[PDB]
């Protein structure tokens, strides 16, 4: 199968500014009929893929001409002359010249906005859940930007990475922020052998860590 390589994996762009994405194929995409079947598409979060470009440079009619495609042979580029809010999502190149059809891995486009601090909240295990014999401590870190953030759990002052699971939302299409939940899961017995539980975050918006903590008594 023909390998399709996209650069960069990630773009971060302010509204009104240009961007471009590179697609390189392992073999020439020129077919024996003289056409080059190289295609671009956008998948916005929660939506179905949308055609952007076909035959290297041909523009889908639902797409504005701030998008253009170029290239030949093995090298192609998607250019956006000025990025708008709705451009949020994952861009893919794909080839129809060689059997099987194959896709690039995708380039995720994030919209830059002004820094925003996370709102951090910590929650002890509910009474209910303790009765199952399990215990989850939940931390929400909501509406922050940029996405770069480091979240640590400390039990009686000591770091713990075991039993931690994190889940991130997609960038909000309304305010351009991210949110994440970090959940620390113990057995009830393990939970009950410690006193102090902390959710600690580091982000560029504050000169010191954001700390949210409880003792349980």
């Amino acid at each position: 199968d023909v390998v399709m390589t996209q650069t960069p994996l990630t773009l971060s762009v302010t509204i009104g500014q240009p961007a471009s994405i590179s697609c390189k194929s392992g073999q020439s995409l020129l077919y024996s009929d003289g056409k080059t079947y190289l295609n671009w598409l956008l998948q916005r979060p929660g939506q179905s893929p949308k055609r952007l470009i076909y035959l290297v440079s041909k523009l889908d009619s639902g797409v504005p001409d701030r998008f253009t495609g170029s290239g030949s042979g093995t090298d192609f580029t998607l250019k956006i002359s000025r990025v708008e809010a709705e451009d949020l999502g994952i861009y893919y190149c794909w080839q129809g010249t060689h059997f099987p059809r194959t896709f690039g891995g995708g380039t995720k486009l994030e919209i830059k906005r002004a820094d925003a601090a996370p709102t951090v909240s910590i929650f002890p295990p509910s009474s209910e859940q303790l009765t199952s014999g399990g215990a989850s401590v939940v931390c929400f870190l909501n509406n922050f930007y940029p996405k770069d953030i480091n979240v640590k759990w400390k039990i009686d002052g000591s770091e713990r990475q075991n039993g931690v699971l994190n889940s991130w939302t997609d960038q909000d299409s309304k305010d351009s922020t991210y949110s994440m939940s970090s959940t620390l899961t113990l057995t009830k017995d393990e939970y009950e052998r410690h006193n102090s539980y902390t959710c600690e975050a580091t982000h560029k918006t504050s000169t010191s860590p954001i700390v949210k903590s409880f003792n349980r008594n």
């Binding site: 893929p49 035959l55 709102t119 859940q129």
Partner: protein, 217 residues
């Protein structure tokens, strides 16, 4: 006009069978070559199968050759994908797509397929109320932890949908071969707890709906 609506997705055991359908409308179905593609949980896109306008020619990549059959009923404007010998690596969102303009021009909405021997299990739903120690107070954040269900999806709403803003519902994660998700909602410290806040959780696979009122600790 161009509309493509897949159905038939669901949970299937490894080695089992499922038949997907795609209902087409708004265009002369029988004049176009049609294809199936899928998007994996890691957001990779892959081509699955293609069929000629008249149904005579079928094409399959090696990943599915011998296991999947694509067919169409031009009398009923409907495309099908018969899937046999299913494996866990076939878990994906399957899309039908119209082949036209030297590529693909329209994609469907997708139908979700999970291949697993794990059984359908309804969720446990636990309230997330703040620890008995507080502070901050213009706004208070509350949540529900929706733990130990399978398969996807669940839906979460707060006060039956009256609420919407201030809510974040995070993508599920896998934990002990079952899904766990969290949802936060943020409200004025005045309206809670003097006014009631309830998360409503639907898990259509187990035909289950849970309301959990959040009460103070």
């Amino acid at each position: 006009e161009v509309k493509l609506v897949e159905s038939g997705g669901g949970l299937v055991k490894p080695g089992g069978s499922l038949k997907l359908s795609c209902a087409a409308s708004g265009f002369a179905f029988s004049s176009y070559d049609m294809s199936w593609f899928c998007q994996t949980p890691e957001k990779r896109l892959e081509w699955v199968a293609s069929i000629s306008s008249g149904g005579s020619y079928t094409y399959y990549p090696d990943s599915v050759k011998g296991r999947f059959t694509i067919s169409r009923d031009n009398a009923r404007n409907t495309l099908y994908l018969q899937m046999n010998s299913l494996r866990s690596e076939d878990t994906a969102l399957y899309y039908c797509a119209r082949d036209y303009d030297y590529g693909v021009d329209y994609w469907g909405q997708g139908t979700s397929v999970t291949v697993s021997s794990a059984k359908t299990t309804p969720p446990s739903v636990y309230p997330l109320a703040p620890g008995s120690a507080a502070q901050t107070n213009s706004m208070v954040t509350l949540g529900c932890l929706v733990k130990g269900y399978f398969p996807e999806p669940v839906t979460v709403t707060w006060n039956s949908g009256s609420l919407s803003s201030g809510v974040h519902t995070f993508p599920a994660v896998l934990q002990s071969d079952l899904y766990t998700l969290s949802s936060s909602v943020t409200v004025p410290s005045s309206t809670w707890p003097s006014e009631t806040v309830t998360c409503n959780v639907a898990h259509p696979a187990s035909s289950t709906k849970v309301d959990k009122k959040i009460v103070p600790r």
